C-alpha cells in the first residue's frame, strides 16, 4: 500500500530513495526483494533515504520495500565466540547457523555516571612497552595511533593471543577476557590471515571477529563497530569481561562521510559530517567498568586510527585522542629502525596509569617512560658530536640497553611476572656489562632460564601479588644472579 510498504524511486552507491513508507521510524531496518537488508537514515517530506547493507546492483527502481518494524539489532552471547560474522551478525566462516539466544540494538546510549566503577584491574597486552609504560585497565579506552605499517594491528592481535595465559581460570580470582576484533575496510585476505592465526593458536575459542571489508558496502563499515560493541556489551552487562578492537575507526569515519554526502547531508570540517566526533564518542563511551551493584563486568576498547605522515594534529585523530583515556602512538621512524613495538614514549600515555597495573609492576615500572623519553632526547643531542660528559654517557649506555629490552617480536607476549623481572633487570644495572648487540640474546636466555629453573617464583608472583621489596626482591636478585653465572 503506502504506510507499511514503499516503492524505490532511485538507487545506487549503497543508497536508495523510497516513495511511501509513511509509518516507518528513523533508524528502522527494512527488507528489499531478494532478502537484502537496509536502514532508514533520512525521513523526508516526499521520500525516505535508505542506506543499503547488501548488494545494491540487484535492486531496481519500482521494487517493493517492506518494514521490519524494528531498529537495527544484531545477535549476541557466547554462541558468537569462535565465529566470524559480518556487520549484521550473519556468519561468514561457513560453520553453519549461529543459533543465538539473544538480540541487541547495535547503536545505543552508553551507561550513565552511576553504574560505573573506577578502572582498577589489568588488561594485559603481554608487551613490555605497553604493560609497563602505557598500562591498559579493564573498562579503559586506549587509542592505538600511527601511520600504515607501524605495527598497530600486530599490537592488538598480540593482546588477544596473550589472554590464553590468563583465560579459563574462573576459580583463582581471574575473569576470562572475551575478545572482539572488528575489521573495518581491510582486505578480505588480511582478515582471513588474522583469523587463521587466531584458530591455529586456539585464541579463536574466546574471540568473535566482525568483518566489514574493503569490498563490503559503506553502510556495513559504518555499522560494524556499533554492532560489535553490542556483542561486547553482552559480557559487560552479565558480570563478564570483554575486549573490543576497532581496526580501524579512520575507515568507519570515511564510510560515514560517503553515506552522509550520498544522502545529500551538508559537509562539515574536512567534508566529514558535522557530528563525526559524536560517531566515535558515543561508540567509545560504551566501553566501561561497572560497579558491584551492576555485576562488576567490563568492556575495554582498543580503537585504532591511521595518521598520514605522523600528523596527530589532524581532525579525526584529534577527535579520538580527546575521547579515549590516553593513546599509544606508534612511530614510523622507530619502526623503520627496528625499534618494535614502535612506542613514542613522549606522546604515548595511559590516563589510568598505576591503577591498571599489578603491585609488582607498579613497584618497578614507574620511572621507565620518563627515562626512555629523556634517553631518546639525549641520543638525538649526541648526533651533533659535541662533548658528552661521563654522566651523559652513563644515561646513553643505560637507555640504549633499556631500548633493546623494550624490543619484542610478534606473537611473543610475556606474563606480568616475566615483564616485572625484565624491567627490574634493566633498571637495576644487570645489563650494564653486556654489549648493546647482545641484550635481546641475554633477555631470550633469561626468559628460558626463568621458565625452566624458577617457575615457582613466576607462579608465586602471579597469585600472591606484592611489590618488589624485601623477600620477593631477594628472589628476583637471586634469579638474575643465577642466570648471570650461566651466561658467563
Amino acid at each position: 500500500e503506502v504506510a507499511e510498504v514503499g516503492q524505490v524511486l532511485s538507487v545506487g552507491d549503497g543508497i536508495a530513495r523510497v516513495y511511501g513508507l509513511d509509518k516507518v521510524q528513523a533508524g528502522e531496518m527494512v527488507e528489499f526483494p531478494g532478502g537484502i537488508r537496509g536502514m532508514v537514515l533520512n525521513l523526508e517530506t516526499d521520500n525516505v533515504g535508505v542506506v543499503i547493507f547488501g548488494d545494491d546492483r540487484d535492486i531496481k527502481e519500482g521494487d517493493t520495500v517492506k518494514r521490519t518494524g524494528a531498529i537495527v539489532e544484531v545477535p549476541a552471547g557466547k554462541e558468537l565466540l569462535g565465529r566470524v560474522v559480518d556487520a549484521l551478525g550473519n556468519p561468514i566462516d561457513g560453520k553453519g547457523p549461529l543459533n543465538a539466544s539473544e538480540r541487541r540494538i547495535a547503536d545505543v546510549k552508553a551507561p550513565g555516571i552511576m553504574p560505573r566503577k573506577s578502572v582498577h584491574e589489568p588488561m594485559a597486552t603481554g608487551l613490555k612497552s605497553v604493560d609497563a609504560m602505557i598500562p591498559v585497565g579493564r573498562g579503559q579506552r586506549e587509542l592505538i595511533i600511527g601511520d600504515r605499517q607501524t605495527g598497530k594491528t600486530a599490537i592488538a592481535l598480540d593482546t588477544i593471543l596473550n589472554q590464553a595465559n590468563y583465560n579459563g581460570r574462573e576459580a583463582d580470582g581471574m575473569k576470562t577476557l572475551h575478545c572482539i576484533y572488528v575489521a573495518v575496510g581491510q582486505k578480505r585476505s588480511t582478515v582471513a590471515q588474522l583469523v587463521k592465526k587466531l584458530e591455529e593458536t586456539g585464541a579463536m575459542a574466546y574471540t568473535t571477529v566482525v568483518a566489514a571489508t574493503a569490498s563490503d558496502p559503506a553502510p556495513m563499515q559504518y555499522l560494524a563497530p556499533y554492532s560489535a560493541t553490542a556483542m561486547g556489551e553482552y559480557f559487560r552487562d552479565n558480570g563478564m569481561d570483554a575486549l573490543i578492537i576497532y581496526d580501524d575507526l579512520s575507515k568507519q569515519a570515511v564510510a560515514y562521510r560517503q553515506m552522509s554526502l550520498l544522502l545529500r547531508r551538508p559537509p562539515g570540517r574536512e567534508a566529514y559530517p558535522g557530528d563525526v566526533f559524536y560517531l566515535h564518542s558515543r561508540l567509545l563511551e560504551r566501553s566501561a567498568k561497572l560497579n558491584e551493584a551492576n555485576g562488576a563486568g567490563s568492556l575495554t576498547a582498543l580503537p585504532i586510527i591511521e595518521t598520514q605522515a605522523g600528523d596527530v594534529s589532524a581532525y579525526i585523530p584529534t577527535n579520538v585522542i580527546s575521547i579515549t583515556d590516553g593513546q599509544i602512538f606508534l612511530e614510523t621512524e622507530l619502526f623503520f629502525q627496528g625499534i618494535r613495538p614502535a612506542v613514542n614514549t613522549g606522546l604515548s600515555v595511559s590516563r589510568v596509569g598505576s591503577a591498571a597495573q599489578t603491585k609488582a609492576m607498579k613497584s618497578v615500572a614507574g620511572p621507565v617512560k620518563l627515562e626512555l623519553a629523556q634517553y631518546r632526547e639525549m641520543a638525538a643531542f649526541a648526533q651533533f658530536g659535541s662533548d658528552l660528559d661521563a654522566a651523559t654517557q652513563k644515561l646513553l649506555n643505560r637507555g640504549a640497553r633499556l631500548t633493546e629490552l623494550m624490543k619484542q617480536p610478534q606473537y611473543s607476549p610475556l606474563t606480568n611476572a616475566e615483564i616485572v623481572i625484565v624491567i627490574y633487570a634493566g633498571t637495576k644495572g644487570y645489563l650494564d656489562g653486556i654489549p648493546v648487540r647482545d641484550v635481546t640474546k641475554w633477555e631470550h636466555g633469561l626468559l628460558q632460564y626463568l621458565r625452566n629453573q624458577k617457575a615457582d617464583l613466576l607462579e608465586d608472583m602471579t597469585k600472591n601479588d606484592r611489590k618488589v621489596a624485601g623477600e620477593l626482591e631477594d628472589a628476583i636478585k637471586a634469579a638474575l644472579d643465577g642466570y648471570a653465572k650461566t651466561y658467563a
Binding site: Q25, L43, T45, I113, D275, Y278, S281, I321
Partner: protein, 456 residues
C-alpha cells in the same frame, strides 16, 4: 495549535504547524516511543515549517507524530533542590536519586543584565586562598581560567573554591560538565562526596549543583548544557544576593558542540578557541544583587603532553614543578596573573606587597642554579637574605584545604584578605626573619606561623 513532524535527518527535525508558529529558541515536545523528546527551534523555513535540533536521540521518530509548542524556551528546575544533584540539559536527574522536587523553574535562554544595576568598577572576589588573593586575585563577574594537567591538585582546588565561597561568602556553586569523559564525571562526583561538598544524606546542605552533558550525548545536548548550568547559578544569585561560582569543564567542548550543530544545519566551515564564550559571556557579571564568576577548566585536545590571556580576567596556573617541592596548592606564583592586580582596583598596599613578593621569588629563581651547583656561601650577603625570605614566602604561599582534611587529617583554613596582605608585607619587611622555615609551611596567616614556631 499543535504541529507535526515532516522530516528527521539525524539530530535535525522539521515540524510543520497549523496555528501560531513557534519563535526561535522555543522548546517543543514530542513522544518518541513513550519517552518524551525535547526539540529546540532553530530556523523558520517557510510553508509554515520550523527547523529544530533534538536534545536526545531521534531514532524511532515517525513522520506525522504530534508536536507541542511549550510557549517559551527550555525550562529547568532551579533553587535548593538542585544542590547535590546531577541534572542533564533539560533538567532531568541523571544521578539515580529520584525526582527533583523544585518549586520554581527558569528558562535556559535569558537576556543579559542591562547597564542599570551592573556594579560600578571592578571588585575582588576573596577566595581565602593566600596565593590567589595576593598574586592573581579573582574578580567578581570575571572570566577565570584554571590551567593544569593531572596530578597537580586541580580537582582539589575546584572543590575548595566551592567550599570557600559557601563558607566565607554564603554563596553557591554550579559545575557544568560539558562533553567530557563519563568515567571522569563519575570520579569527580565521588571525589566531591568524599570531601563533603556534596552530601548524599543531607543534599540541601551541599555546596554545589552538578549539570552533566558528557561525550555520550548528542550535539544539541552538549551545546546547551552549559546554559542550563548558568541558569541554575543565576537563580542562586537572584534569590540570595550572594556571590556565585559557575564552573565550566570546558569551553572547547561547548564550542565544539556548537560547531557540530552549525555544520548539521548546513553551514560552510572555514588561541581563543579554548577560552572564548558565546553570548553566554554577557550573563557572567557582577550586579548590585550579587554576582556570577566563571571558573573555567581550560582544555584543548592536548592529551599528548601536559601561553597568555585571550578572554580571561585572571589565570591560575597549576605547576608540576611546584607540586614536587611539596607546595599545595601547586600554583605558580609568577605565571599566574590578574587584570585587577592593579592599584586602582585592589589598593596601593595590596599591589606593592604582591609586586615585592614577585620580585623576591623572581630573584630567587635567578640564583637557583648557583645554589644547586655551589653552596649558599657563594652568594653575597644581600642575595643570601632575599633567598631566606623567598624560601619562607614559597612555603607561606602553601595552605591546607578543608577539602583535603579527609586524606591528610589536618584542618583546612580560609585566610582573610587583610591577614594575607599584612602577613606577607611583614615578611617582606623582615619582621619574621628570626622564625624557622617550617613554621611558614602549611598554615593560615602570620598568627598561625607564630603558633607553629612556638611548638617547634
Amino acid at each position: 495549535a499543535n504541529g507535526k513532524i515532516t522530516q528527521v535527518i539525524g539530530a535535525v527535525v522539521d515540524v510543520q504547524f497549523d496555528g501560531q508558529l513557534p519563535a526561535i529558541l522555543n522548546a517543543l515536545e514530542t513522544e518518541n516511543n513513550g519517552k518524551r523528546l525535547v526539540l529546540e527551534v532553530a530556523q523558520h523555513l517557510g510553508e509554515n515549517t520550523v527547523r529544530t535540533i533534538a536534545m536526545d536521540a531521534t531514532e524511532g521518530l515517525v513522520r506525522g507524530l504530534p508536536v507541542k509548542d511549550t510557549g517559551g524556551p527550555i525550562m529547568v528546575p532551579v533553587g535548593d533542590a538542585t544542590l547535590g544533584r546531577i541534572l542533564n540539559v533539560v533538567g532531568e536527574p541523571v544521578d539515580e536519586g529520584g525526582p527533583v522536587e523544585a518549586t520554581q523553574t527558569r528558562a535556559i535562554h535569558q537576556q543579559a543584565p542591562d547597564f542599570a544595576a551592573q556594579a560600578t568598577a571592578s571588585e575582588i572576589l576573596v577566595t581565602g586562598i593566600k596565593v590567589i588573593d595576593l598574586l592573581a586575585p579573582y574578580s567578581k563577574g570575571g572570566k577565570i581560567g584554571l590551567f593544569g594537567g593531572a596530578g597537580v591538585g586541580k580537582t582539589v582546588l575546584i572543590m575548595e573554591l566551592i567550599n570557600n565561597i559557601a563558607k566565607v561568602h554564603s554563596g553557591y556553586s554550579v559545575f557544568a560538565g560539558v562533553g567530557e569523559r563519563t568515567r571522569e564525571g563519575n570520579d569527580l562526583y565521588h571525589e566531591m562526596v568524599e570531601s563533603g561538598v556534596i552530601k548524599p544524606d543531607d543534599l540541601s546542605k551541599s555546596q554545589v549543583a552538578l549539570v552533566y552533558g558528557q561525550m555520550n550525548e548528542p550535539p544539541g545536548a552538549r551545546m546547551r548544557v552549559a546554559l542550563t548550568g548558568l541558569t541554575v547559578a543565576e537563580q542562586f544569585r537572584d534569590a540570595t544576593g550572594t556571590d556565585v561560582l559557575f564552573f565550566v569543564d570546558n569551553i572547547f567542548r561547548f564550542t565544539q558542540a556548537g560547531s557540530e550543530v552549525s555544520a548539521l544545519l548546513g553551514r560552510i566551515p572555514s588561541p581563543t578557541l579554548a577560552t572564548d564564550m558565546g553570548a553566554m559571556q554577557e550573563r557572567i557579571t557582577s550586579t548590585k544583587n550579587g554576582s556570577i564568576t566563571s571558573i573555567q577548566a581550560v582544555y584543548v585536545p592536548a592529551d599528548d603532553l601536559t601561553t597568555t590571556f585571550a578572554h580571561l580576567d585572571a589565570t591560575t596556573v597549576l605547576s608540576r614543578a611546584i607540586s614536587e617541592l611539596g607546595i599545595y596548592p601547586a600554583v605558580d606564583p609568577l605565571d599566574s596573573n590578574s587584570r585587577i592586580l592593579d592599584p586602582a582596583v585592589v589598593g596601593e598596599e595590596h599591589y606593592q606587597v604582591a609586586r615585592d613578593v614577585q620580585g623576591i621569588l623572581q630573584k630567587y629563581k635567578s640564583l637557583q642554579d648557583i645554589i644547586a651547583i655551589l653552596g649558599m656561601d657563594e652568594l653575597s650577603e644581600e642575595d643570601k637574605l632575599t633567598v631566606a625570605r623567598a624560601r619562607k614566602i614559597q612555603r607561606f604561599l602553601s595552605q591546607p584545604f578543608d577539602v583535603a582534611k579527609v586524606f591528610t587529617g589536618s584542618d583546612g583554613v580560609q585566610v582573610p584578605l587583610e591577614d594575607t596582605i599584612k602577613s606577607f608585607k611583614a615578611v617582606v619587611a623582615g619582621e619574621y626573619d628570626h622564625l624557622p622555615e617550617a613554621a611558614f609551611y602549611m598554615v593560615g596567616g602570620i598568627e598561625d606561623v607564630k603558633a607553629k614556631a612556638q611548638r617547634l
